[PDB]
Amino acid sequence: TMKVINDPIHGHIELHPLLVRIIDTPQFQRLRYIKQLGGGYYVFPGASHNRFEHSLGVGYLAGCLVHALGEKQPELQISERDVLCVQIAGLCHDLGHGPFSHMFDGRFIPLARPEVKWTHEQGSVMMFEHLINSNGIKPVMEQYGLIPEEDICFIKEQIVGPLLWPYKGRPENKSFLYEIVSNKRIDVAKWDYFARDCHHLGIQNNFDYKRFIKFARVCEVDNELRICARDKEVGNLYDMFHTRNSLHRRAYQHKVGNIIDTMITDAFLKADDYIEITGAGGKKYRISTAIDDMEAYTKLTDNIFLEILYSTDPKLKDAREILKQIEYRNLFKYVGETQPTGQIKIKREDYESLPKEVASAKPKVLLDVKLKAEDFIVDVINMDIDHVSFYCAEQLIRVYCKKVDRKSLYAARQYFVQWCADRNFTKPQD
Amino acid sequence: TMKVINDPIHGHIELHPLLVRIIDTPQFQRLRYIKQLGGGYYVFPGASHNRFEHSLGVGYLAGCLVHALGEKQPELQISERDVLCVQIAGLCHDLGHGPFSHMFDGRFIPLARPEVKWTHEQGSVMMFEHLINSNGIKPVMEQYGLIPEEDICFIKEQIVGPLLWPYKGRPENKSFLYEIVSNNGIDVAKWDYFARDCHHLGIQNNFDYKRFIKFARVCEVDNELRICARDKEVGNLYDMFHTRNSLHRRAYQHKVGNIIDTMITDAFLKADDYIEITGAGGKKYRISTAIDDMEAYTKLTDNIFLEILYSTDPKLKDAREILKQIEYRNLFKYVGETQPTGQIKIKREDYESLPKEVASAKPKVLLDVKLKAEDFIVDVINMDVSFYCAEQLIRVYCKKVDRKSLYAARQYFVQWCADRNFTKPQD
DNA sequence: CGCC
DNA sequence: CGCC
Ligand SMILES: [Zn+2]
Ligand SMILES: [Zn+2]
């Protein structure tokens, strides 16, 4: 006797009582107010979904994979305690996302605070412990057969990775369990958001996850235990990689969608000094420092968009006038694309310095109106098959300009070509 | 070649440039921030959709059907102007919705101001005219061949209805055009949200609108030009009505979803005196009076939920703590259901008085625990073809959820339905 | 009662 | 450039 939540992707999702008492907290329900695809909704109107229902799907998928593993191979000693912590890990892996998901830690906090190293996964670890303490979950955890001190750290390890054996939460015989929720070397997170995102985007999904689950086993490579699929399933995995490619080309890397993300990020930056969120002890925080106090971060969601847009505050009129140009669909303009040469990749610490480098370049022929750094938006688009074990351009740089007259736009495209020449990046096309 | 919006229900939606220039206004994009099912999202997580994408679907379908009618029967004199005005009517039928959709005008405003008579359709008319003047749409209309005065009133009439022939926007040789956007109860708006809601709820819809449009035509019935389908497709409509029945019993009238709607309304009522929305000329409005100025109403959306939830103001803690019991899933509890069979139905004007009645009734059998009116919620759920070859439910919830309060509440409910001659509640 |  |  356990609770059921109806889901359009997975149908009925049965929830162990302990999962229910993690979901029914303000820290988890927070995910109802953060859109999964960020500003992609302003391009795909079917993409209204938030991290909340996605994380229900990931928790469900995680639990159905290891319970299927434990029933096909009982020799692997998979307690139902192990299933409860894998389910909790999938449920909370996204707890640390901020407004508009990957826009927040992928762009905004790099540009507002290049010094800090911040990821949503660290956010999830912090928010997970804030969730556990504020709602008295540690007693409820042992009541359902979990050992909190070792099992909370097991949960945290599944979300954020390691600190021979780097993991303290599970022994090395249960190594396979760490490949389920987030495998950073195919995980149940991409299973859900591949199906969910195409459902809302109108893209077809030819990956069948339930057919991957039923024929999946744990095999041995390296003397290490891994999750492995049948030779009969390579056609399915060719499909998994194809829809991942179409989701990226068509949605995640959409040209208009990515510009709008950087427009929202611009409005946050110009609002960052004047917006206050009350955290612990009345301490007031800002959008960029809310990540330092979880009580404030809990109230940092996509709501900050509408609060800026609905504001009367005169100090917020630069930010408010950017969000208002999104409604009028007068956006930054697409100058061009380029990719870093070799395996070299740009780093978040240097994002802020990118528009100043482009303005400093000297093009071949002079034009009267000259551009400064603030006329440029430099957009760094990162994406992140034979590592799959059976048995029987990763970075894009796009440049936009906030000037939309034809003479500014030509000039902007001659500071982009020179910048590429200077850094020896691939030459832009048309 | 024109702008294209990819939609999960309809695929590609081509939009006339004029439609693009009303969509890309703050008054229309406002619908991105109003959930289609209101609080149903707190029960069905797939139901994250908003009025914006629904209204895109209605403008598309409206133009599809009218273009199909003019293509099969050119005798009917259907110009571009008529289809552009039918499309605009479909796009803007829902402009007047408030936070959480039907909750706002169906419950909140009756309880916050039982005096005034308000509907979202009157809102859509008011907001449509605010959209047109603030965004300089009247010249753009002229550009594409529209006559503003008669074509704007034609659009308003399609939304909210008229004031022999009651309509001033089109003659009766074009009588059929008023049957498309809002109606029999078969309009292109219910086609979209049946498909859209079932897509996001996981309910299955096998009603085919695309072939109902293809075999539809206008016909003569009792002195009148009306839209008609082949008697061939009674089978298509039997399925449409089944999915309407499924969406109502399973989703629209869900017991917990409706309880949460009345919890959100309760927090709105307790926040209504302390929330300020700035309208035209800096003039400040409240949640219940923002409907009086469209410049303020533009900024009244579901965001107001999170403004209450994230507030520090001490005057907003009664409201904030109701929304906090939604997050903790400690909700009002279901006491019972009844119907006024055989009786004058409850009216929005009487809504406020209903809890005081329930708490004033008390059976021949007394018990120790005794409730007051604010401990009760009274929820009034209202339900509301030519071919060619339970009206009202009242549910009662209690805000005290201990076993002894709930037992009493169920004995004030059983005796309030004998006092009102409503049907006896069953178990 | 995020199962009608 | 809410079509890739
Ligand atoms: Zn995820
Ligand atoms: Zn509608």
CB atoms within 10 A of CB B313: 13
Domain of B356, CATH number, reads 3.30.70.2760
Position A429 in a domain: no
Check CB contact of B29 with chain A, cutoff 8 Å.
Answer: yes
Contact call for B48 and A48, based on CB within 8 A: yes
- Is strand C less than 7 A from the beta carbon of B250? yes
> Rounded to an integer, what distance in angstroms lies between the CA atom of residue B126 and that of residue B116?
16
- Is residue B221 located within the same domain as residue B142? yes
> Rounded to an integer, what distance in angstroms lies between the CA atom of residue A227 and that of residue B339?
57
Strand B224-230 and strand B386-388: the pairing is parallel
Rg of chain A on CA atoms, in Å: 23
Tally the residues of chain A: 430
Domain of B74, CATH number, reads 1.10.3210.10
- Is residue A159 located within the same domain as residue A193? yes
Check CB contact of A202 with chain B, cutoff 8 Å.
Answer: yes
CB atoms within 10 A of CB A18: 19
Nearest to A18, CA basis, from A158, A129, A144: A144
* The residue to which tokens 């140009």 are assigned: A325
Instruction: From residue B254, give the alpha-carbon distance in Å to each of A287, A358, B43, B398.
Output: 37, 57, 9, 17
Position A349 in a domain: yes
Name, in order, each residue with C-beta under 8 angstroms of A135's C-beta and a sequence gap of 6 or more. Answer: A21, A25, A27
Position B258 in a domain: no
> Rounded to an integer, what distance in angstroms lies between the CA atom of residue B411 and that of residue B221?
53
- Token representation of residue A404: 């939309």
- Strand partners for A65: none
What residues make up the domain containing A339?
333-384+393-423
- Is residue B56 located within the same domain as residue B76? yes
Q: Which ligand is nearest to the CA of B121?
A: 2
- Is residue A220 located within the same domain as residue A369? no
- Token representation of residue A113: 């605070």
Residue B288 near residue B247, CB atoms below 8 Å? no
Tally the residues of chain B: 427
- Strand partners for B334: B397
Structural domains counted in chain B = 3
Strand B3-7 and strand A333-338: the pairing is unpaired
- Is strand C less than 7 A from the beta carbon of A24? yes
- Is residue A114 located within the same domain as residue A226? yes
Position A46 in a domain: yes
Return the sign of the alpha-carbon dihedral for residues B76, B77, B81, B83: positive
Query: Cα B407 from chain centroid?
Result: 34
Which string of b and e fits B169-181 if b means at least 16 CB within 10 Å?
Answer: bbeeebbbbbbbb
Position A430 in a domain: no
- Is residue B248 located within the same domain as residue B302? no
CA–CA–CA angle B412, B414, B415 (5° rounding): 65
B:253-282 residues touching chain A, CB 8 A cutoff: 277-278
Query: Cα B220 from chain centroid?
Result: 31
- Is residue B17 located within the same domain as residue B123? yes
> Which residue of chain A is at minimal alpha-carbon distance from B251?
A6
| Residue after which a domain boundary falls, among A327, A346, A366 | A327
| Residue after which a domain boundary falls, among A221, A256, A291 | A256
Position B424 in a domain: no
CB atoms within 10 A of CB A425: 16
Name, in order, each residue with C-beta under 8 angstroms of A91's C-beta and a sequence gap of 6 or more. Answer: A19, A22, A23, A28, A55, A56, A58, A59
Q: Which of A120, A130, A200, A254 is catalytic?
A: A120
- Is residue A102 located within the same domain as residue A251? yes
- Token representation of residue B190: 């219910």
> Rounded to an integer, what distance in angstroms lies between the CA atom of residue B405 and that of residue B369?
6
> Rounded to an integer, what distance in angstroms lies between the CA atom of residue A280 and that of residue B322?
22
Nearest to B395, CA basis, from B357, B418, B359, B425: B425
| Residue after which a domain boundary falls, among A226, A256, A286 | A256
Check CB contact of B238 with chain A, cutoff 8 Å.
Answer: no
Which string of b and e fits B280-300 if b means at least 16 CB within 10 Å?
Answer: eeeeebbbbbbbbbbbbbbbb
Residue B240 near residue B207, CB atoms below 8 Å? yes
For C2, nearest residue by CA–C1' is B43
Distance B193 CA to ligand 2 centre (A): 7
Nearest to A375, CA basis, from A350, A353, A354, A403: A403
**What's the maximum distance between 2 C-alpha atoms anywhere in chain B?**
76
Query: Cα A357 from chain centroid?
Result: 28
Determine the angle formed by the axes of helices B148-160 and B80-92, rounding to 10 degrees: 40
Residue A372 near residue A359, CB atoms below 8 Å? yes
Instruction: From residue B252, give the alpha-carbon distance in Å to each of B182, B257, B348, B383.
Output: 19, 8, 19, 10
Position B124 in a domain: yes
Nearest to A217, CA basis, from A386, A70, A402: A70
- Is residue A279 located within the same domain as residue A404? no
> Rounded to an integer, what distance in angstroms lies between the CA atom of residue A145 and that of residue B251?
36
Residue B155 near residue B89, CB atoms below 8 Å? yes
Residue A262 near residue A400, CB atoms below 8 Å? yes
Residue A35 near residue A100, CB atoms below 8 Å? yes
Distance A242 CA to ligand 1 centre (A): 19
Any catalytic annotation for residue A120? yes
> Rounded to an integer, what distance in angstroms lies between the CA atom of residue B191 and that of residue A47?
20
Position A230 in a domain: yes
CB atoms within 10 A of CB B231: 11
The single-letter code of the amino acid at A353 is S
> Rounded to an integer, what distance in angstroms lies between the CA atom of residue B257 and that of residue B52?
21
Q: Resolution reached, in Å?
A: 2.6
> Which residue of chain B is at minimal alpha-carbon distance from A39?
B32
- Token representation of residue B96: 């007047």
Instruction: From residue B52, give the alpha-carbon distance in Å to each of A241, A329, B55.
Output: 32, 15, 5
Experimental method: X-ray
CB atoms within 10 A of CB B1: 4
Instruction: From residue A428, give the alpha-carbon distance in Å to each of A325, A416, A418.
Output: 28, 8, 10
- Is residue A311 located within the same domain as residue A378? no
Three-state SS letters, chain A: CCEEEEECCCEEEEECHHHHHHHCCHHHHHHHHCECCHHHHHCCCCCCCEHHHHHHHHHHHHHHHHHHHHHHCHHHCCCHHHHHHHHHHHHHCCCCCCCCCHHHHHHHHHHHCCCCCCCHHHHHHHHHHHHHHHCCHHHHHHHCCCCHHHHHHHHHHHHHCCCCCCCCCCCHHHHHHHHCCCCCCCCHHHHHHHHHHHHHHCCCCCCCHHHHHHCCEEEEECCEEEEEEEHHHHHHHHHHHHHHHHHHHHHHCCHHHHHHHHHHHHHHHHHCCCCCEECHHHCEECCCCHHHCHHHHCCCCCHHHHHHHCCCCHHHHHHHHHHHHHHCCCCCEEEEEECCCCCCCCCHHHCCCHHHHHHHCCCCCCCCCCCCHHHEEEEEEECCCCCCCEECCCEEEEEEECCCCHHHHHHHHHHHHHHHHHHCCCCCCC
Instruction: From residue A64, give the alpha-carbon distance in Å to each of A19, A69, A74, A391.
Output: 14, 9, 15, 21
For C4, nearest residue by CA–C1' is B250
Distance A193 CA to ligand 1 centre (A): 7
Query: Cα A210 from chain centroid?
Result: 24
Check CB contact of B328 with chain A, cutoff 8 Å.
Answer: yes
Residue B243 near residue B209, CB atoms below 8 Å? no
Three-state SS letters, A227-278: EEEEHHHHHHHHHHHHHHHHHHHHHHCCHHHHHHHHHHHHHHHHHCCCCCEE
> Rounded to an integer, what distance in angstroms lies between the CA atom of residue B427 and that of residue B425?
7
CB atoms within 10 A of CB A151: 20
- Is residue A212 located within the same domain as residue A322? no
Contacts of A56 in chain B (CB under 8 A): 45
**In which region does residue B406 sit, left (phi positive, over 0), alpha (psi from -120 to 50) or beta (all else)?**
alpha
- Is residue B46 located within the same domain as residue B177? yes
> Rounded to an integer, what distance in angstroms lies between the CA atom of residue B226 and that of residue A123?
60
Three-state SS letters, chain B: CCEEEEECCCEEEEECHHHHHHHCCHHHHHHHHCECCHHHHHCCCCCCCEHHHHHHHHHHHHHHHHHHHHHHCHHHCCCHHHHHHHHHHHHHCCCCCCCCCHHHHHHHHHHHCCCCCCCHHHHHHHHHHHHHHHCCHHHHHHHCCCCHHHHHHHHHHHHHCCCCCCCCCCCHHHHHHHHCCCCCCCCHHHHHHHHHHHHHHCCCCCCCHHHHHHCEEEEEECCEEEEEEEHHHHHHHHHHHHHHHHHHHHHHCCHHHHHHHHHHHHHHHHHCCCCCEECHHHCEECCCCHHHCHHHHCCCCCHHHHHHHCCCCHHHHHHHHHHHHHHCCCCCEEEEEECCCCCCCCCHHHHHHHHHHHHHCCCCCCCCCCCCHHHEEEEEEECCCEEECCCEEEEEEECCCCHHHHHHHHHHHHHHHHHCCCCCCCC
Instruction: From residue B380, give the alpha-carbon distance in Å to each of B265, B338, B353.
Output: 13, 10, 12
